[model samples]
Target: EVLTGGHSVSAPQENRIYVMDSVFMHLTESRVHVYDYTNGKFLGMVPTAFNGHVQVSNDGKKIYTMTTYHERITRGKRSDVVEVWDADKLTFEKEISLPPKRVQGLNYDGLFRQTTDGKFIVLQNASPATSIGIVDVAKGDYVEDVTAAAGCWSVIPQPNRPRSFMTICGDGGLLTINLGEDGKVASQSRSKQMFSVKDDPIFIAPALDKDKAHFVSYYGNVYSADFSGDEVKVDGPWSLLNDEDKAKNWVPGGYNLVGLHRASGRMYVFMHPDGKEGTHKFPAAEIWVMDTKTKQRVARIPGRDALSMTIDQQRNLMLTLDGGNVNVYDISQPEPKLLRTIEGAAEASLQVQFHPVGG
Candidate 1:
C-alpha cells in the first residue's frame, strides 16, 4: 500500500515514538500535516515560514527549520536562517542566521550532546564549500565556524566530549576538531587517507563504541584503531565491503554519509541514496547494515532512501530524510523496519533528534 505520505522521498526523523501519534507531513509551502499514524487521520495542519530544512529536537518538543529568503539589498540576494518553534503549539520561536550564505548544504554534528554544560547544539555547513559552524540555540548564535579540511561532508561528535567533533572531507576524508574545555575549537586532526583520493568520500562517522576511536568511509572502507597488547593502531586500509560489491556501488561524486548507529555488536550505515549522478541502483539503492566488529555487510534495507539519519536508542527508532519527506523506522525488531512516514518539502527533514526532549 502506498502510505499516506504523498510524493515524499526520505524516511521520517527517529527521535520520538513515545506518543505513538501518527505521521507528520511537511509540505512545499507554509504547511505541515499531522495524521494519526496508526489510522492515518489528518490530525491538523501546522503553519510554517520555511518549507524545507526542518528538524526536531531529540525530545520532539522543539522543531528547528532552515529557510532561504531574499535580503533586499541592491538586488534580490539569498539569506539563510534557522527557525525554532514549539512543536506542540506549532508556534514560532525565533530565527538564527548562519552568517554568509553557503551552497545550501548544511550538516548537524553527531556530537551535539557534549558541549559547554551539555548545552544542545551541533555543527553547521559541514561541507567543503563552508566551515563547520557551531549552532548555539540557547545563546541563539550560529557564530562559530570549525576549521577543518575543505570539501567536507559529514561530522560525528566525540561521545565523551568536553566539546569536539570529527568530520570527513569529500576529498580530505577524516579530520578531528576538539572544543576547548570551555567549548571552543581546541585542536584539529589532519585529513588522514583511509582510501584513495581518486575515491571521493561521502560521509564520515566515528566508531564511538569501539575501544579506541576510528572511523568508517562510505567509500566501502573501514578505518579503525587496532589495539594489540597495550599498543594501539588505526587502519584505513581495511575494506568493509568486498571489491565487486564495492565496485558496483562506487559513487564517485561526493555524497553525504547521514549517520551511524551501532550497539550490541551490530551497526547501521546510513547514506543519501538520491544524488547528482544518481546511483547504480537508483530507487533500489539502500543503506548498509553491517556487523561492526567484523566489518562485514549483513543485510540491505532497500525501498525508500534517506539523505540523513539519527538514532533514538531509548525508543529503538530511526529518523530520516528523503528529498522532501520525513520518515520514522522502528529498529526494535531483529531487523530495523519502517514504522511511520512523514512528508515534507525539499530539505524537508534536515535533522532528526530525540535529545532535545530528554526522552
Candidate 2:
C-alpha cells in the first residue's frame, strides 16, 4: 500500500518567520529556512539558488527571491532571476529572468524590496558600478536597470509613492529616484550631505515607519528621513545614549541592527560597549530600546549576541538572529521576554523577515 498523507503549510500568518541563509560554506546553494514564531517549530524551506535575497508579498501569498544561477555549479554560463514561491504551500512556483548584474553580496532587507503598490520590485545591482534593476511583478518580467544611481547603494522604497525610491550615496546624501509609468527613471535628485561618512557613518538599512526612515549611526545616534514628499526631508541627530552610557563608549552595531515596533514607537538596537573605530560591526551585548518621541532609552535587554532582528508588529513579537540560532521574544512589555530559541535555524544568515500577519 502507498502512503497517502502529505503536509501543507498554512496560509502566511503573523507567526511565520523566514530566515535567509546564503550558506557561505557552500556558496552555490542558498536556502530560506521557515519557522513558526509561536513555538519555534522548524517548518519547510524554499531554495533561492545562489547568494539570493528574499522578500515576501504584502498580501503574503507569494515569496520573491532575487537569485542567481550558474550552469556549472558556480562557474559556467550565469543566469539571474527572481524565483517566486507559494508562500502557503512552501513550493517553488516560477522564476522571472533578470540581468546577470544582480549584487551577489550577503542578504540585507534593502537589497530587494517591493514598491508600495506592489506593482514593481526594485533590486540592488552592482557591476562594479552601482545601479538597480526594476522588475514588474504584475507582468512577470524584468523591466530595465536604472543606472542613474551610480554612487548610491540600497533601495528604500517610498511608502506613499509606489514608483519612487531613495538610495544612500557614498558622500552621505540621499538619492531619490522617481519612476515614470514605463518603469524607467523619470527624475532623480540628491539631498545635501546628511551625515559625515568619514567621522560617523549610518547603516544603509533603516527601520521604516510608513514613509519615514529611521537610521541609526555607529556612534549611537538616530536620524529620521521623511520620504513622503517629492523632496526627502531629514531631521534629528538625536542621541540614543545618555551621558552615562556615552561615557562607557557604547555604540550601535551589527548587520541588521535597527528595528522599530511600529505600534509602540519603540526602536530597538544592538548595542555594544567600548566600541572603537573598526568595532562598529561587532555583535551586540545588549539591545537598548528607545522611545522615538522622547529620544530616550526605555529599557536595556540582553542581546543574546543577535546580529540581525525583525519585529512582528501585529503579534508584538521580536525575532533576532544570533549566529545560527533564532531567538524569539515577546516584545509586548518594555523589556522583551525570551520565549524560545530555535538553534541552528540558519547557517550564516544575515537577514530575517516576518510574514505579513493578516495580509
Candidate 3:
C-alpha cells in the first residue's frame, strides 16, 4: 500500500514529527527539530550537516539520514556520510562513510529508503549518471551500488517485491530494479515511456495509494499508475484544473505539491491562482482536495504560505510547515478545522516527516 521510508510496512504513526530545517542553505549546521504533533509541544532538535531525507527506524530506535558536506569541505573535496542517531537517547550513534555513490544533496523525501525487509538502506547517487548506493545498516557498511537510470532523483521500494525498488526515468518511464539475495542488482527493466516533455511533464513528487503511485505534472495534470502489477499501467491523465479553474489559471504549485490521505482516498494538491512557469517553486496559497473515485475536487482549504505538508492519517490530523511556523489542522470532519499554530518553531523550516513510532 503506502510504502514510506523505503520499507513496505508503515510504522504505526506516533505523535512525534521531525522537521528538516534550513536544508538547502545551511552550511555546517542544520536542525531536525522534534515536536509533538498531537499537541503544541516542543520536544528537541537533532543537529546535522546539510541533510536530505530523515527517517526513524521501524523499531523507533534510530534516525537515519544522508549528510551532504555542502558546507563542510574536509581537506580538498566534500565528503558525505550517513549519520545515524540513537532515537531513544537522541545521541550521536555513528557516522558511516558513504562510498563515492552516496545520496544527492539536501533533496526532498524518498531520496534515501531502506528496503521493506530492513536489510539495507538504498540511497540515490548521481555519478554524472544515475545510480543507487546500498548501505548495509545492520553491519554499517556501504555495500555496493547499481546503475539505475538517467535523471533518478528518488527511489520507492516496490510494493509487492521484497528486494526491489522503482525509480522515475528522465524520459517519463519507470525503471524497476530487483536486487539479488546478495543485496545487489539482480535484474532490471524499464516500462514504456508514459509522458513526453512537451506533453504532461510530471513532477518528481509521487504519492502512493495501495499499489498505485500518483504523480502530478508541473502544469497540474494528475496521473495514476498501478505499481502492483507487472507493468506501470496508466489509469488517467486527468486535468487537475477544470474549466473554471483554468479560466482563473489555478494550477498546482509548491514544494512537495501533493499529499496522499490513503484512508480517505483523497489527494491534497497545493495550488495557486494565476500560476505561471516559476510559481511551482513558491509556497501555495490554497489546498485543493480531490476525490480519486469521482475524479473531482470536493473541497478547497486556504493554506497561506504553506510550503509543505504531510498527514498523520490514523489520527486524521494534518501537519503543515508553512514559513517558520507549524500549523496543525483537524481534517477528520468534512472541512479541515484549524487546531493550533506553533509560532517560530525554527528560523526556517523546509520539510516535515512523521515517523510511526507507536500507536
Output the number of the lDDT-best candidate. 2
The worst-scoring run of ten residues by lDDT in candidate 1 lies at: 15-24
**207-234, model 3: which lDDT tens digit per residue?**
6665777888877888776777766676
- Arranged by lDDT with the best first, the candidates are 2, 3, 1
Model 2, TM vs. native: 0.95
lDDT of 2 by residue, 1-359 (tens): 87763457753466688999989998678889888877778778888777879998988888998888888865899899998888877778888998778988977788898777777889999887888889888788988788878888999888778688889988788998888776778898887777888876898778878778899998888888887677888876888988899899999889888888888889889999998888877988999989887989999988899899988887888888976988988999889999889988988898889988545
* Candidate 3: Cα lDDT at 127: 67
Q: Where does model 1 exceed 4 Å of error?
A: 1-51, 58-61, 71-78, 106-120, 125-129, 147-151, 170-173, 181-183, 204-219, 224-234, 240-260, 269-281, 285-288, 300-310, 319-329, 337-359
Tell me the TM-score of each prediction against the true structure: 0.65, 0.95, 0.89
Highest TM-score scorer: 2
* Whole-structure CA lDDT of model 1: 0.49
Per-model C-alpha RMSD:
7.9, 1.7, 6.3
Regions more than 4 Å wrong, model 3: 1-13, 23-25, 69-74, 101-104
312 Cα displacement, candidate 1 (Å) = 2.2
lDDT of 3 at 197: 55
